């Protein structure tokens, strides 16, 4: 089928550099013209930067202009990105998407890749800090409890939390990671009804493999 | 390098109607305008070209209208594997460039956000920061309005919030935000408020 496998994001520090590349395969990657685009979450879409079926041309967004290069192996089916003096900004995830070939001269992406991301942060890798969320006996909405795992500042993304796995008040609610100034902070709670608390236990399973493991409540 | 406008960033929508999402190119950009839908995965498709072009596989469901810097999508029948976001882009002249997005949400009734406070605890204290967390619990639509009161006082810049995005059952959102201080911040104040303006009552809560 049409494909595109994106490899080598990863942590980079500002200064630094980084290579992805793009595996084609379903497609005579020798007729079409490769592109990379961005989504820097926050920010959208951006067009980073084209080669041409066998690159004799190519286009830079003014903003990766003179650090990045785009390149490819036709017999190796390979698109590649080589990226220098890495920004903060250029923490993206990376699509490679091919053009399109058919409108004369209209630029569009009819397939692509499922993303490498790359994040620039001088942050060093760090397993989080876990701190229990607590209810209050036959808690906060008369009938029903509420408690929480705090998973706060950890580096990279991501934390994976669990809890319950079973039936029945399984209401768990990871809210989306928040960057503090540096580092990364989530919360799980679920919501099970006040006659659970003090008659049984939940514990709340973090873990992060830039190391830490930590199950707790 | 048009600047590309979606004027709407999320339509409250219902399955089985009729979406019209639209984009305006600063320049024309004489009918190279394409369209895309990103899954709520990431993962991004290509719908339309050329305007109205339809790309193989993509249902007749989708239609692309346009005049020159006015462009449209429009879903005749919404179907539940059409919630996602929906961007533009003109692919004339370098750099090409995208909207912003028109991203899909589920129409349903008013729901209000049963709201818990959650006080830090030992550990962190012992480390110094207070986290105190307010959560605002399965409500529709998504906008609520916390504000955190330290002693009456009016918090401006230490909360940050998260949002649950719609839930793939029953359709509503969760949020929390989280007031980080210090431990001498902490404790030079003793009453901590969350104070929540939701169209669940014309009431806040706390």
């Known amino acids: 089928d049409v494909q595109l496998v994106e490899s080598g994001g990863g942590l980079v520090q500002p200064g630094g550099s980084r290579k992805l590349s793009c595996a084609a395969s379903?497609?005579?990657?020798?007729?079409?013209?490769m592109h990379w685009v961005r989504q820097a979450p926050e920010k959208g879409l951006e067009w980073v930067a084209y080669?041409?079926?066998?690159?004799?041309?190519?286009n830079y967004a003014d903003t990766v202009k003179g650090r990045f290069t785009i390149s490819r192996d036709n017999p190796k089916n390979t698109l590649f990105l080589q990226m220098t003096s890495l920004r903060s900004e250029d923490t993206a995830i990376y699509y490679c998407?091919?053009?399109?070939?058919?409108?004369?001269?209209?630029?569009?992406?009819?397939?692509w890749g499922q993303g490498a991301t790359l994040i620039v942060s001088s942050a060093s890798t760090k397993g989080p800090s876990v701190f229990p969320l607590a209810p209050s006996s036959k808690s906060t909405s008369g009938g029903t409890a509420a408690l929480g795992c705090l998973v706060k500042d950890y580096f990279p993304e991501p934390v994976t939390v669990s809890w319950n796995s079973g039936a029945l008040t399984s209401g768990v609610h990871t809210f989306p990671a928040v960057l503090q100034s540096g580092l990364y902070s989530l919360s799980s709670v679920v919501t099970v009804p006040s006659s659970s608390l003090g008659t049984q236990t939940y514990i709340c399973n973090v873990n992060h493999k830039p190391s830490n493991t930590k199950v707790d409540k | 390098d048009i600047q590309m406008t979606q004027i709407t960033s999320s339509l409250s929508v219902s399955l089985g109607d009729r979406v019209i999402i639209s984009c305006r190119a600063s320049?024309?950009?004489?009918?190279?305008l394409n369209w895309y839908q990103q899954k709520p995965d990431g993962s991004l498709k290509l719908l339309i070209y050329?305007?109205?072009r339809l790309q193989s596989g993509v249902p007749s469901r989708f239609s692309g209208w346009g005049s020159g810097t006015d462009y449209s999508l429009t879903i005749s029948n919404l179907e539940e594997e059409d919630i996602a976001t929906f961007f533009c882009?003109?692919?004339?002249?370098?750099?090409?460039?995208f909207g912003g997005g028109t991203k899909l949400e589920i129409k349903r009734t008013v729901a209000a956000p049963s709201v818990f406070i959650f006080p830090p605890s030992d550990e962190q204290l012992k480390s110094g920061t207070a986290s105190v967390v307010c959560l605002l619990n399965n409500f529709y639509p998504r906008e609520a309005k916390v504000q955190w009161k330290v002693d009456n006082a009016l918090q401006s810049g230490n909360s940050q919030e998260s949002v649950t995005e719609q839930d793939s059952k029953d359709s509503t959102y969760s949020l929390s935000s989280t007031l980080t201080l210090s431990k001498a911040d902490y404790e030079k104040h003793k009453v901590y408020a969350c104070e929540v303006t939701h169209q669940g009552l014309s009431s806040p809560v706390t």
């Open positions: 998407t091919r053009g399109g070939t058919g409108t004369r001269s209209l630029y569009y992406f009819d397939y």
């Open positions: 080669i041409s079926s066998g690159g004799s041309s190519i």
């Open positions: 050329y305007t109205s």
């Open positions: 882009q003109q692919g004339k002249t370098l750099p090409y460039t």
């Open positions: 379903g497609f005579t990657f020798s007729n079409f013209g």
């Open positions: 320049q024309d950009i004489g009918n190279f």
